[PDB]
Amino acid sequence: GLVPRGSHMSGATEACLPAGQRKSGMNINFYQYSLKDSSTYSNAAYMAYGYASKTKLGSVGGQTDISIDYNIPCVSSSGTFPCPQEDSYGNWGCKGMGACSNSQGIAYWSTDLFGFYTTPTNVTLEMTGYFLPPQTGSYTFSFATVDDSAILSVGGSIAFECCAQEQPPITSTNFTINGIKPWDGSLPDNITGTVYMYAGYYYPLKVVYSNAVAWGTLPISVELPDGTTVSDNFEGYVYSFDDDLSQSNCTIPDPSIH
Ligand SMILES: OC[C@H]1O[C@H](O[C@H]2[C@@H](O)[C@H](O)[C@@H](CO)O[C@@H]2O)[C@@H](O)[C@@H](O)[C@@H]1O
Ligand SMILES: [Ca+2]
Ligand SMILES: [Ca+2]
Ligand SMILES: [Cl-]
Ligand code: NA
Ligand code: NA
């Protein structure tokens, strides 16, 4: 046929073509999250949009290295150093450092999350931007692990609305990756999610991440249609655009026929 048929039952992921100045990286907003609150981050509504009803702590823009790997301090005989969780032991010490004198259960202040001075022990953050596929085909996003709770959403009207990156969060709970901490204490039952994407369209991307205590971990990757994997550093794939609510043609409801 002269034209492609289109994805069945309007199945294509909505994307966008913002016309404004493109900036490298994602925007990261930080919101208050209570130390040792083991319930708030287990709600879908909280993880999709409720986080923004808490106090906003600040923000940083242009972030391309988006994985989280926050290690709490061990106050040791030789000074204060971050302890990889797998090296913690006993009650407690850190391998190569001896016994730690400090509590695993208090808040700690650090710039480890994107250079922003906050409490990485207890915080929620929202990463927003647009993912630019260089190749048409299936992309599989993943979280290697989640500590404590996280979601990843891709697509117009799922992550956020086209040309409206800076708006308050939309209410969609149609997560691409549901890594929400289960109430039961188990592990989310699936921390990959696949999206079919058309080269050259900008796909809204949102990551919401929460830590309630101690270590914070979120290693983010994407497998490209060519079978290669991009991990942690998404430079060249993620971009931001200032809001332009006036750009009439910004939304591409079906990139397969556009
Ligand atoms: O999943 C909750 C929590 O688990 C682990 O922390 C536990 C323990 O090791 C800590 O001493 C106390 C601090 O109050 O909290 C838990 O009982 C860590 O894996 C942590 O990152 C995680 O949030
Ligand atoms: Ca919409
Ligand atoms: Ca934690
Ligand atoms: Cl040791
Ligand atoms: Na770590
Ligand atoms: Na430290």
From Swiss-Prot:
Compartment(s) of residence: Secreted, Cell wall; Membrane
UniProt-annotated glycosylation sites, renumbered to this chain: 122, 174, 190, 249
PTM section of the record: Extensively O-glycosylated. The GPI-anchor is attached to the protein in the endoplasmic reticulum and serves to target the protein to the cell surface. There, the glucosamine-inositol phospholipid moiety is cleaved off and the GPI-modified mannoprotein is covalently attached via its lipidless GPI glycan remnant to the 1,6-beta-glucan of the outer cell wall layer.
Region Sugar recognition: start-end pairs: 184-227
Domain of life where this protein originates: Eukaryota
Domain PA14: start-end pairs: 61-236
Known uses: For many industrial applications in which the yeast S.cerevisiae is used, e.g. beer, wine and alcohol production, appropriate flocculation behavior is one of the most important characteristics of a good production strain. The ability of yeast cells to flocculate is of considerable importance, as it provides an effective, environment-friendly, simple and cost-free way to separate yeast cells from the fermentation product at the end of fermentation.
Record function comment: Cell wall protein that participates directly in adhesive cell-cell interactions during yeast flocculation, a reversible, asexual and Ca(2+)-dependent process in which cells adhere to form aggregates (flocs) consisting of thousands of cells. The lectin-like protein sticks out of the cell wall of flocculent cells and selectively binds mannose residues in the cell walls of adjacent cells. Activity is inhibited by mannose, but not by glucose, maltose, sucrose or galactose.
Domain notes: The number of the intragenic tandem repeats varies between different S.cerevisiae strains. There is a linear correlation between protein size and the extend of adhesion: the more repeats, the stronger the adhesion properties and the greater the fraction of flocculating cells.
Similarity annotation: Belongs to the flocculin family.
Protein name listed in UniProt: Flocculation protein FLO5
Organism field: Saccharomyces cerevisiae (strain ATCC 204508 / S288c) (Baker's yeast)
Taxonomic lineage: Eukaryota, Fungi, Dikarya, Ascomycota, Saccharomycotina
Gene designation per UniProt: FLO5
Residues of the full protein shown: 23 to 271 of 1075
